[PDB]
Design a protein around this ligand. Sequence first.
Ligand SMILES: [Mg+2]
Ligand SMILES: [Mg+2]
Ligand SMILES: [Mg+2]
Ligand SMILES: [Mg+2]
Ligand SMILES: [Mg+2]
Lengths: 171, 191, 197, 106, 290, 136
Amino acid sequence: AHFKEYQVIGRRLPTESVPEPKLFRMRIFASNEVIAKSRYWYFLQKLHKVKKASGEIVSINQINEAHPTKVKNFGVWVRYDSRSGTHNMYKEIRDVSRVAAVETLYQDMAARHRARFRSIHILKVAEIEKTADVKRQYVKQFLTKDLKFPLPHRVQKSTKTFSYKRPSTFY
Amino acid sequence: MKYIQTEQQIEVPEGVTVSIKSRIVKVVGPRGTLTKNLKHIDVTFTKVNNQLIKVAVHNGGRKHVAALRTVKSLVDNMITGVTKGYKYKMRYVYAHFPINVNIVEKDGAKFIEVRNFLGDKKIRNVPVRDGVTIEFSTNVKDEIVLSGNSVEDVSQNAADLQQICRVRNKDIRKFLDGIYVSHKGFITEDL
Amino acid sequence: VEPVVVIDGKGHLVGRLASVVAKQLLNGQKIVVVRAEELNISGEFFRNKLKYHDFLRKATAFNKTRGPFHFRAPSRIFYKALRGMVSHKTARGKAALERLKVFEGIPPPYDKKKRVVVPQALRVLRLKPGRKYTTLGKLSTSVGWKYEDVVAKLEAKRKVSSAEYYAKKRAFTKKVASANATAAESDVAKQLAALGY
Amino acid sequence: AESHRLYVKGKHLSYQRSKRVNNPNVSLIKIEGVATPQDAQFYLGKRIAYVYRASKEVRGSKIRVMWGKVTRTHGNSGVVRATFRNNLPAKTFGASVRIFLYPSNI
Amino acid sequence: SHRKYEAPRHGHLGFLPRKRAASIRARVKAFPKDDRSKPVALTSFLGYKAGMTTIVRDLDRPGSKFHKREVVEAVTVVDTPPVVVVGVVGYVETPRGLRSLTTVWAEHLSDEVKRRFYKNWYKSKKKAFTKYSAKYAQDGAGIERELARIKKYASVVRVLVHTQIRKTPLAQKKAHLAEIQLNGGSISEKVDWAREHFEKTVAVDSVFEQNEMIDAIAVTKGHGFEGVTHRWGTKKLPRKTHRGLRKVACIGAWHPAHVMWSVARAGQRGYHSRTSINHKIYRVGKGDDE
Amino acid sequence: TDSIVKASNWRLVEVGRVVLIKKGQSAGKLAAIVEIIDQKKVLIDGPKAGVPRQAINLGQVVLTPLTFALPRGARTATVSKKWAAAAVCEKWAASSWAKKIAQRERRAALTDFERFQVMVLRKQKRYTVKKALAKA
RNA sequence: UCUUUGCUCCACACAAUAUAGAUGGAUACGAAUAAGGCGUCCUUGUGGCGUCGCUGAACCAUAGCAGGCUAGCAACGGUGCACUUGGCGGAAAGGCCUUGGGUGCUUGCUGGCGAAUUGCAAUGUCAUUUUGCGUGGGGAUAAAUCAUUUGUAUACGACUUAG
Ligand SMILES: [Mg+2]
Ligand SMILES: [Mg+2]
Ligand SMILES: [Mg+2]
Ligand SMILES: [Mg+2]
Ligand SMILES: [Mg+2]
């Protein structure tokens, strides 16, 4: 759905052999807390010997963007399973928030690679804080001085089905 | 990847005048006038300084952008052909049978007539396009010269005259007879 | 909204116009489509010519006189597109197709009348630029329509007369707009502008 | 004046139906000028009349009437559901019907 | 399974349906393309087939073995009394075809031609064109404006002519009437030619000349209901065929479970309208001449 | 004579471009393009009208001929200052586009008595105009 | 037209007949859409300048007993009905424009009289399609089929001929 970012912190269940375990943490892009906690265990099962029965969750917290109105350039590192095998990707996305970037990334991957949410892993999302570290021309194109461009061929949507004059595509 | 701006420049010499409404181009120069229709291309034109015209595509892909430099070349060739002109020299090639090339006027249409190609009794007729001028070159043996403003018309006339003289039912590696374009240039070379 | 609606088919996509028209007819609206020779189809000319040849190949084998009839004019190509969107084997469908007329060109009375368009069926609004399209008159005369020229001649005549009408109408509305502007700067005009007119 | 109309014009479109089964006890009405349910809400509870003519005069009139009422909105494009005392004949698909402005809540 | 041995279709499918012609006079379904430069002339003529006979002539065909040598050839004779021009009618183009707008007639129609508008002439007041003829006698009012209408319109013009059947030995007494297109120029000149030739006669010498190629359009000899053998040229089945040998044996496969239109079936033979092209004229002969 | 090329200028998407919002919670308010994010969306801010600073697709907005000076990334206070400096809203109200919007709103807000008054006044104006269209 | 006064067109008088469905107006350029409309100017063009669009949410019409009876003021306009002049229109033109006067209305403005009881709503009846019977005013005075006959035709019908 529309995504949100969640800080999820988890902990192997305490014992007498070892109380106070090491309190692992993850950032999860998800539409709600149930899916956030599901994915937390999905990944922590891949990294460590733990599962939802032998562990617990100490805190789940929503992370909002600190600057939701600055236009950021993000780099995203992705693992995705194709039909033949598994691959890695670096994609640059110019957007205003991490969640918007991740939405756009899932859509671009669904479109250009027929990869699904179950097939995609997010490794990290990182704000490129210096221009000229960008390396994708489709983002570098909008980083030009005093940029300006038109929108040719405007289409005005009609409330009616009959129009009594020929329309115009001026703008 | 949807380039948001791609431009190409068109330099305009001294005596030429370029008039571009919607996408109908008209070039007027010393050697005559030419006009073209580019309503199939979706580009925009912009006059800069009365000797420079920019051609732009906005939010275009690989093909839409590839057509921009094509437009640039087409208008450049109209200008080149109305200032200098275009001249295609063709040579006749034969081993045994002399090819007899003449010009005739059937109903005032100015056809080219090729006779005795490989002993053929067929008389092969190529129509001359309007805007093309034919000269059988003295100072060279068996050479014809097609000159005009429109490179399209000139080169298509040359291709017609070169393809009407194709050999059938033989090995063309041995039977090389024909009429072949030797040179493509201008009437005012190195002005 | 109007008793009968005259649609100028120029610039329209066949299937989209047909789906608009069929629904309008079934909802009770009388329609007359003119200038069906200038209807547009998406896809290149060869691509649509092959599609029509494929449909032309289809015929009742033991007797071709009772098979899918292949109507070659653009008006009937449109009608074919449209009664496939209408349930024409019912009395309701028959009544709806009786609420419809299709013409090549703009013949009499509908030439002295107002024509409208359907924006959600217009090519310039619906197709991306660069996407090729074919013209129905060209397709029709390619597949056997004989009257592509006479409609052109008659339409040139129609356009001459229509321009001579529009000149007069223009010149008259100028007198009108000048008289109205002079009648402005008035108590009545100001009291009307206060109320939005 | 020239206009004496105190009703909104409408068209009887169809019956409540699935792909393959209809319900004549509910009819669908298209109201002119309405293109969304938020604007079609003005017409709920209003009286509807299908006025038709016959050759026989019954009680002083060759004009007979079916009375119904608007019940609820149908869809997203301003079509409404209507219920008549006796259902509509189904030859009236595409026929004109009158939506009156009473009972008014203005 | 597949036909053991190949053979062609018996008959021509573009000459179907092999039915009786709608009339005894075949109609011209195409006239020569008009050049609006040459004088005004008829593109066709009406005559009656008399018979065939034998001709001798010296052949001029350089390359043949019979060059400058006598050959014997069969010719057919068509009695062509001069036709009589009574009327014209103008056709204008429409997106649904050529359409006639007006038909102007002559003032005086002869009996043999107004017999064409009756099925029982012996009992009639004969009452034909008796008001159209009074449409004349006021100078040109109801006629000249019709002709001017044809001038203002009518991209195509055709003259109505009839035969002088009484000049033939036929005992029919009823003239054949036909539309014949004019292929001069200047539709005004076409219709003026017609108006001048109203009530007047046109001879075959003004239309056809010697060594000219022409087409003959006629309804062909009738032979009634005929079997598939002579109607289509199919093979006779062998002698020991039960229930007839003068038949087609298989009239179709099991599927399509139908008799196909392309299968030879018994029916009408003859009385079809036929156009036969490229018949050279060997003589145009006059009757004011022994 | 010399070369002539019909320019065909049309409404560049640029910082400082004033856009009318077409659909949404604003739905008729003005804003200024403050930054460009992609070919299809821009960051806007319309503080004088109450439009919060937000990213928006260009189908939700209509561009106007108006344009004022802004550095890209400009914050809401800077936009509010430069907007009043450049006098945007009065330049908009002076346009026939805005006058037509206001005509529409007024005609909608009219009542029945006012609708009677305008037809009376229109008949008067018609009398005068059709008297005028008989002497010239 | 003397199958015993028939046929047709028009007028209005009454009956029947139905309605795929009026209930202010189907309000006329053409072409392009990576371009146009409108104004204006000039040296008349692929011209310059200005303006418009971002929908018809428009334009026009619209007040009066389902739209009454009257008086006046101001302008010489608007609109309807029947006549009348001259044109244009053939793609299915059967319509568009125009001249002259006559007549009626005029809500452009100011007034007077009337409405009630359909009883708190009941489409609350106003349209066009055809047909028929009547009156009164014009207009015109045939064919086909059977039977007979013909054979350019033909199973029979049909076709082609004649009387
Ligand atoms: Mg055919
Ligand atoms: Mg085989
Ligand atoms: Mg076999
Ligand atoms: Mg034979
Ligand atoms: Mg046997």
